Amino acid sequence: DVFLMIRRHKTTIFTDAKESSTVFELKRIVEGILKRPPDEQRLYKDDQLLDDGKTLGECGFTSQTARPQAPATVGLAFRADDTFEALCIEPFSSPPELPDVMKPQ
């Protein structure tokens, strides 16, 4: 059982899937959520594309690095006029950086 975050720009999908599940099943999930056919989607893991026939465990999504308390980011892009934009995962807001207590004045 593997937990992911599909991060099409500002959207974030907290879906769950099995390791034995294929990438095309994940695209079907995104189809069920974003109403986009699987041919329109291109999934990216760490700026590396995922083949449709590859299983989720094949691409590097194990239940040890994509646990529910820290899911693994999975990029996604949508086809725009017979093309495909690059991944544009916008970063989350930077937390207020707490200063180190041992930093000298």
């Binding site: 975050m5 500002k10 959207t11 907290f14 769950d16 820290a70 937390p95």
Partner: protein, 96 residues
């Protein structure tokens, strides 16, 4: 079965509806005039909660739903030291 938890920065965390109803406040937001969103997912606006805090809240939702009533040993939720203060006010406000 999916709800779009829009954050203050415009981030749209699409989480499963069963997951989001863990928190009492989102359950209250999705009850009444807030459930009139006919367009599939119910967009919940969170103009106070930032994206980095709402993301950890959604991760807590999918963590508590998965790890509920489980006989196995349960790891604690990882909360960063710099985010604990902001997540604490969002945990009170959301009643999660």
């Amino acid at each position: 079965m999916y709800v779009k938890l829009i954050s203050s920065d415009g981030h749209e965390f699409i989480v499963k509806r069963e997951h989001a109803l863990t928190s009492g406040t989102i359950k209250a937001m999705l009850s009444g005039p807030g459930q009139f969103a006919e367009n599939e997912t119910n967009e919940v606006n969170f103009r106070e909660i930032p994206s980095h805090v709402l993301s950890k809240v959604c991760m807590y939702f999918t963590y508590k739903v998965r790890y509920t009533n489980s006989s196995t040993e349960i790891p604690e939720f990882p909360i960063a030291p710099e985010i604990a203060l902001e997540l604490l006010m969002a945990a009170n406000f959301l009643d999660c």
